[PDB]
Amino acid sequence: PQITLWKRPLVTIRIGGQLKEALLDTGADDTVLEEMNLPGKWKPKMIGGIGGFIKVRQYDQIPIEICGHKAIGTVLVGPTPVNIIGRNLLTQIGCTLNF
Amino acid sequence: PQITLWKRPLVTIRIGGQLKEALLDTGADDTVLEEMNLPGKWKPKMIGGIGGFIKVRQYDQIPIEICGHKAIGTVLVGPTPVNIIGRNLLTQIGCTLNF
Ligand SMILES: COc1ccc(S(=O)(=O)N(CCCc2ccccc2)C[C@@H](O)[C@H](Cc2ccccc2)NC(=O)c2cccc(O)c2)cc1
């Protein structure tokens, strides 16, 4: 689709059979989800945003369907304030910015 | 332009006698610029991101040129690590997400 920006670019994602709302975020290098359980090994990681650094759990090779487009990649889980789809998965679904 | 997301979508903006590199950021409601002493009235504000909140100065009706496209709107100035062009200006220059 083409998504305009007068509203937040929130979309439905499917991850582990669960439907969630997530923000398509070109300013995010990584995909960061609110705390949830995901299967498999994770490793502790730290990431930084506008207000400082947080601790997250890094899960690799996780399938995420974003508005019906399939990605398989790294998902960080932690105290992000909102679910964020970052460039690591936006590139997999062929997302670009256009003006 | 079409801008892919393999790297951070950094572009040149101009605000007065300062050309600046800024992130085209669909996950940002507002435009947040690194510390700069803009003229005119402003209002204090707190904005929240990953890691918590920062204190910023809200300046209104500031002209900002982004890759040659003219915009005018609210600019938040504060201790952000990166200049962020948010949706308030992205819409004005006709920016969409496409996949
Ligand atoms: C109201 O206006 C704004 C509010 C917030 C922001 S933002 O910069 O924090 N923010 C709002 C996000 C939604 C959100 C909303 C509410 C809480 C938490 C997240 C904009 C993000 O795109 C942000 C931009 C960025 C990049 C580098 C350094 C610093 C910031 N990226 C990130 O936080 C980020 C995420 C993952 C990995 C990474 O390396 C960076 C910008 C504008």
Experimentally determined by: X-ray
- B18's CB contacts (< 8 A; 6+ apart) are B36
Please state the domain extents for chain A.
Answer: 1-99
- The 8-class DSSP code of residue B88 comes to H
| A25: closest CA of chain B, how far (Å) | 4
Q: How many helices (H) and strands (E) does chain A have?
A: 1, 9
Question: Residue B33: its chain A contacts at CB < 8 A?
Answer: none
Tokens standing for residue A59: 């899960």
- The third-level CATH classification (topology) of the domain covering B1-99 is Cathepsin D, subunit A; domain 1 (2.40.70)
Selection from A21, A29, A30, A24 nearest residue A9 by Cα: A24
Distance CA A8, CA A5 (A): 6
Selection from B71, B73, B84 nearest residue B33 by Cα: B84
Give me the sign of the Cα torsion angle B66, A51, A26, A88: positive
Q: Report strand pairing: A18-24 vs A10-15.
A: antiparallel
Query: Please, what is the end-to-end C-alpha distance for chain B in angstroms?
Result: 15
Distance CA B29, CA B51 (A): 17
Kindly list the catalytic residues of A: 25
| A61: closest CA of chain B, how far (Å) | 18
Residues 79-98 of A with CB under 8 A from B: 80-81, 84, 87, 90-91, 93-98
Selection from A97, A79, A99, A73 nearest residue A24 by Cα: A97
